[PDB]
Design an enzyme around this catalytic site. Structure first.
Site, mmCIF file in Angstrom:
data_model
loop_
_atom_site.group_PDB
_atom_site.id
_atom_site.type_symbol
_atom_site.label_atom_id
_atom_site.label_comp_id
_atom_site.label_asym_id
_atom_site.label_seq_id
_atom_site.Cartn_x
_atom_site.Cartn_y
_atom_site.Cartn_z
ATOM 1 N N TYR A 164 -5.077 -19.557 -3.761
ATOM 2 C CA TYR A 164 -6.370 -19.368 -4.408
ATOM 3 C C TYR A 164 -6.523 -17.915 -4.850
ATOM 4 O O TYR A 164 -5.862 -17.016 -4.316
ATOM 5 C CB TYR A 164 -7.514 -19.780 -3.481
ATOM 6 C CG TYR A 164 -8.051 -18.664 -2.630
ATOM 7 C CD1 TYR A 164 -7.312 -18.155 -1.580
ATOM 8 C CD2 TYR A 164 -9.320 -18.126 -2.871
ATOM 9 C CE1 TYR A 164 -7.809 -17.134 -0.790
ATOM 10 C CE2 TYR A 164 -9.828 -17.108 -2.084
ATOM 11 C CZ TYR A 164 -9.061 -16.617 -1.047
ATOM 12 O OH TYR A 164 -9.547 -15.613 -0.267
ATOM 13 N N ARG A 183 -4.450 -22.095 1.038
ATOM 14 C CA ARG A 183 -4.133 -20.683 1.125
ATOM 15 C C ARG A 183 -2.654 -20.764 1.527
ATOM 16 O O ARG A 183 -2.280 -20.780 2.698
ATOM 17 C CB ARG A 183 -5.000 -19.989 2.191
ATOM 18 C CG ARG A 183 -4.928 -18.479 2.168
ATOM 19 C CD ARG A 183 -5.776 -17.928 3.283
ATOM 20 N NE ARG A 183 -5.839 -16.475 3.240
ATOM 21 C CZ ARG A 183 -4.885 -15.670 3.693
ATOM 22 N NH1 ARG A 183 -3.761 -16.147 4.206
ATOM 23 N NH2 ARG A 183 -5.068 -14.352 3.642
ATOM 24 N N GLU A 187 2.901 -11.539 10.870
ATOM 25 C CA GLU A 187 2.405 -10.439 10.043
ATOM 26 C C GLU A 187 3.532 -9.432 9.837
ATOM 27 O O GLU A 187 4.034 -8.844 10.807
ATOM 28 C CB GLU A 187 1.190 -9.749 10.660
ATOM 29 C CG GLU A 187 0.548 -8.726 9.712
ATOM 30 C CD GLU A 187 -0.551 -9.332 8.791
ATOM 31 O OE1 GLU A 187 -0.766 -10.567 8.791
ATOM 32 O OE2 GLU A 187 -1.199 -8.569 8.061
ATOM 33 N N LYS A 193 -5.640 -7.802 15.431
ATOM 34 C CA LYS A 193 -5.460 -8.094 14.021
ATOM 35 C C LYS A 193 -4.508 -7.049 13.438
ATOM 36 O O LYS A 193 -4.843 -5.860 13.349
ATOM 37 C CB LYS A 193 -6.806 -8.126 13.296
ATOM 38 C CG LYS A 193 -6.716 -8.699 11.900
ATOM 39 C CD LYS A 193 -8.050 -9.282 11.500
ATOM 40 C CE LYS A 193 -7.967 -10.120 10.228
ATOM 41 N NZ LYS A 193 -7.453 -9.363 9.072
ATOM 42 N N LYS A 220 -13.815 -7.097 11.857
ATOM 43 C CA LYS A 220 -13.181 -5.854 11.438
ATOM 44 C C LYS A 220 -14.043 -4.663 11.846
ATOM 45 O O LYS A 220 -15.245 -4.793 12.058
ATOM 46 C CB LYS A 220 -12.913 -5.851 9.934
ATOM 47 C CG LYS A 220 -12.211 -7.114 9.519
ATOM 48 C CD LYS A 220 -11.389 -6.934 8.304
ATOM 49 C CE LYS A 220 -10.605 -8.164 8.070
ATOM 50 N NZ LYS A 220 -9.907 -8.030 6.795
HETATM 51 N N1 LIG Z 1 -3.709 -11.875 15.063
HETATM 52 C C1 LIG Z 1 -3.884 -12.405 13.856
HETATM 53 N N2 LIG Z 1 -4.210 -13.715 13.758
HETATM 54 C C2 LIG Z 1 -4.387 -14.242 12.539
HETATM 55 N N3 LIG Z 1 -4.292 -13.658 11.348
HETATM 56 C C3 LIG Z 1 -3.962 -12.363 11.477
HETATM 57 C C4 LIG Z 1 -3.752 -11.680 12.657
HETATM 58 N N4 LIG Z 1 -3.427 -10.355 12.393
HETATM 59 C C5 LIG Z 1 -3.453 -10.263 11.084
HETATM 60 N N5 LIG Z 1 -3.766 -11.450 10.476
HETATM 61 C C6 LIG Z 1 -3.883 -11.682 9.035
HETATM 62 O O1 LIG Z 1 -5.242 -11.876 8.730
HETATM 63 C C7 LIG Z 1 -5.301 -12.547 7.451
HETATM 64 C C8 LIG Z 1 -6.673 -13.143 7.274
HETATM 65 O O2 LIG Z 1 -7.659 -12.095 7.442
HETATM 66 P P1 LIG Z 1 -7.804 -10.984 6.293
HETATM 67 O O3 LIG Z 1 -9.222 -10.528 6.229
HETATM 68 O O4 LIG Z 1 -6.751 -9.938 6.455
HETATM 69 O O5 LIG Z 1 -7.486 -11.853 4.987
HETATM 70 P P2 LIG Z 1 -7.085 -11.443 3.495
HETATM 71 O O6 LIG Z 1 -5.655 -11.014 3.491
HETATM 72 O O7 LIG Z 1 -8.135 -10.531 2.952
HETATM 73 O O8 LIG Z 1 -7.200 -12.862 2.763
HETATM 74 P P3 LIG Z 1 -8.294 -14.044 2.840
HETATM 75 O O9 LIG Z 1 -9.630 -13.398 2.567
HETATM 76 O O10 LIG Z 1 -7.890 -15.028 1.773
HETATM 77 O O11 LIG Z 1 -8.200 -14.627 4.231
HETATM 78 C C9 LIG Z 1 -4.121 -13.526 7.482
HETATM 79 O O12 LIG Z 1 -3.538 -13.655 6.191
HETATM 80 C C10 LIG Z 1 -3.141 -12.906 8.491
HETATM 81 O O13 LIG Z 1 -1.919 -12.543 7.887
HETATM 82 MG MG LIG Z 2 -4.691 -8.172 6.324
#
Ligand SMILES: Nc1ncnc2c1ncn2[C@@H]1O[C@H](COP(=O)(O)OP(=O)(O)OP(=O)(O)O)[C@@H](O)[C@H]1O
Ligand SMILES: [Mg+2]
Ligand SMILES: [Mg+2]
Length: 367
Positions: free
Chosen positions: A38, A55, A160, A100, A243
């Site tokens: 998406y 996704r 990751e 994260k 965050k």
């Molecule tokens: N411990 C974790 N568990 C799950 N996801 C994680 C973790 N650490 C990092 N991530 C990352 O978090 C992402 C989802 O949160 P994030 O806010 O970073 O998303 P994004 O990359 O902005 O995309 P979207 O908004 O489409 O989710 C996932 O794509 C994953 O790779």
């Molecule tokens: Mg990220």
């Protein structure tokens, strides 16, 4: 079953070209894969059937027939209080939270006898082929064999990919992969964190976990520095993210809520989900970000329709593309319709920059 799921996703990729899309690649073995991803989408889009699984899920294809779910990355998930999915959470139903990591998703797939990684949107991305490189080296031969047997039982291992060259906000010393989770490809069920931990080959790679006893961890995380934050895992297996203000203020454009050209910048980079959840305690700044959000998506909708529809159907088109552009107030979308005569993606890059320049027109009324 899978055919049902593949259909629901195909449906989404017909609704609009900047809501949901797909893309086919071919692998080294010569097999054909289709990735559903998406680009932009509002809360209601996510209410469409199985939209939350669009996704990066990937299907091995046979013509237009899915043969199997070759890769199952996580569902879409949101920051706490970002939208109605993540408001009114019983924080008491948080099972545990996970560090994260700041990097790029890569997910396993089996391609014949080869266990490989795909980035979020491609099996040929730079991150994909480097992650590949990393997994085929001798240090990861125990893990590669374990992920290959997992693939063969039809699981997807989600990592990751972090690196100093791939630095987003946080600064990682070494290039490495970190195991986030493991998903059953068909049912999308997650393997429990405790089972992954019991495997002493996987335990080295697995993302750190923390138990929580009071919802005070969210205030602590909101107010922390040098961390991105956390992924909360619910007792039902769903996830919500928290965050740090520190991260969000560094990941958004500067002075976002003050300069409207900045706020729109935050939106065109997909960073206004973190921002919105940062100001969730401020009804005015929360609901203001939604305004400018809807504005840009309403635009995109209209814009992308007119640009691509016209260019679907010669000085004829030249004069005909003027009737669309001027007929919709935006004569900016005329050189855009010149693209399909020149070459196609490269397009969506141009609609954005053209928005930021006329941006003063679209600023929501009353802001
Ligand atoms: N411990 C974790 N568990 C799950 N996801 C994680 C973790 N650490 C990092 N991530 C990352 O978090 C992402 C989802 O949160 P994030 O806010 O970073 O998303 P994004 O990359 O902005 O995309 P979207 O908004 O489409 O989710 C996932 O794509 C994953 O790779
Ligand atoms: Mg990220
Ligand atoms: Mg985001």
């Amino acid at each position: 079953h899978m055919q049902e799921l593949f259909n629901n996703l195909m449906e989404l990729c017909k609704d609009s070209q900047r809501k949901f899309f797909y893309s086919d690649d071919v692998s080294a073995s010569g097999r054909t894969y289709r990735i559903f991803s998406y680009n932009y989408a509002s809360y209601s889009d996510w209410l469409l059937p199985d939209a939350l699984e669009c996704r990066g899920i990937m299907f091995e294809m046979d013509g237009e027939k899915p043969v199997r779910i070759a890769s199952r990355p996580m569902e879409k998930f949101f920051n706490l209080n970002e939208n109605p999915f993540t408001m009114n959470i019983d924080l008491n139903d948080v099972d545990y939270i996970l560090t994260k990591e700041d990097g790029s998703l890569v997910s396993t797939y089996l391609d014949g006898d080869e266990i490989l990684f795909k980035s979020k949107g491609s099996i040929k991305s730079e991150q994909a082929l480097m992650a590949n490189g990393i997994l085929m080296n001798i240090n990861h031969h125990r893990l590669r064999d374990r992920l290959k047997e997992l693939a063969e039982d039809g699981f997807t291992a989600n990592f990751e990919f972090v690196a100093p060259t791939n630095r987003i906000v946080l600064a990682y010393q070494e290039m490495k992969i970190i195991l986030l989770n493991v998903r059953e490809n068909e049912t999308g069920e997650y393997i429990s964190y405790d089972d992954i931990y019991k495997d002493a080959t996987l335990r080295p790679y697995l993302v750190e976990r923390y138990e929580i006893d009071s919802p005070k961890w969210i205030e602590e995380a909101k107010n922390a520095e040098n961390i991105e934050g956390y992924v909360a895992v619910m007792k039902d297996g769903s996830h919500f993210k928290i965050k740090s203000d520190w991260y969000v203020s560094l990941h958004s454009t500067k002075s976002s809520l003050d300069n409207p050209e900045k706020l729109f910048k935050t939106i065109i980079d997909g960073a206004s989900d973190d921002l919105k959840a940062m100001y969730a305690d401020d009804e005015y700044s929360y609901r203001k970000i939604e305004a400018f959000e809807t504005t840009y998506l309403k635009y995109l909708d209209r814009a992308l329709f007119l640009v691509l529809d016209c260019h679907n159907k010669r000085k004829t088109y030249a004069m005909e593309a003027q009737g669309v552009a001027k007929g919709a107030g935006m004569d900016h979308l005329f050189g855009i319709i010149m693209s399909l005569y020149q070459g196609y993606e490269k397009v969506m890059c141009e609609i954005e920059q053209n928005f930021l320049k006329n941006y003063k027109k679209f600023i929501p009324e009353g802001y």
